[PDB]
C-alpha cells in the first residue's frame with residue numbers, strides 16, 4: 555500500500571513464487587490450456603483476480619461514483635462546431651442505481667472511475683472533489 | 686415546382702478538397718434563410734481557399750436549425766452531369782444538353798394560355814355546318 559506526496563494512494567502487487575504444475579505425458583501436448591515449462595511439467599493457464607473494497611468518505615459524507623470516458627466530439631470534421639475534427643471531452647456517467655455501476659474497464663475510452671462528493675464544489679474548476 | 690433530373694451525386698469523398706470547397710454540391714437542394722448578399726455558396730473569394738472555415742453555404746446552413754418555413758428563403762439547386770469521355774467528343778465535342786424546369790402547379794386555376802389565339806379551331810357545330 556503506497557501513499558504519495560501528491561495525495562495519491564496506490565496499490566502495487568508483485569506475484570512471485572512457483573507455478574502450480576500438473577503432470578504431462580512424454581508425448582502429451584500441453585495443448586492450448588497450459589504450457590510445457592519443463593519436461594513432463596504442465597503449467598495451466600489461469601487468472602489472478604482481486605476485489606479491492608473501498609468504503610469512501612471523499613471530503614466528507616454523501617458520495618457517488620461515475621464512469622469517465624474519453625470521447626471525440628459528436629460533431630463531424632468540417633462542421634462549424636468541430637472544423638478541424640480535434641475536439642474531444644470526457645463523458646461523465648454518474649451511477650444512480652446499483653445496476654448502473656456494473657461496469658468494465660474499456661480501452662476504447664481510456665475509462666477511469668470517479669468517487670466524489672456531490673455536496674461540494676472545487677472553487678476553481680467547479681467540479682466536485684474526488685479521487 | 687422544380688422538375689430537375691440531371692442531379693448527379695458528388696462523386697468526390699467527404700472531406701475531399703472538392704467536397705470542402707463546394708459545400709453546396711453535396712445536395713441536390715439546399716434551402717437557407719434569406720440575408721442580403723448571400724450570393725456565392727463557395728465564398729466571396731474562391732481561388733486557393735482550402736475549404737476549411739465557416740463561409741458560404743456552410744455558413745448559411747450553420748447548425749442547420751434555422752427556420753425556413755413561411756419566411757424569406759433562398760433555394761440553391763445542384764445539377765449537372767458526369768462526363769466519361771468517348772472519342773466522339775474529340776477533337777471538338779457535339780453539344781451535350783442539360784435542363785431543369787420550374788412549372789406553375791396550383792398557381793393558376795386553369796391553363797393560362799387558353800386565350801392565345803389557336804392555330805386552328807373547329808367547333809363541333811361548325812364541323813356540322815361544313816357538312
Ligand SMILES: [Cu+2]
Pocket residue numbers: 768
Ligand atoms: Cu465534360
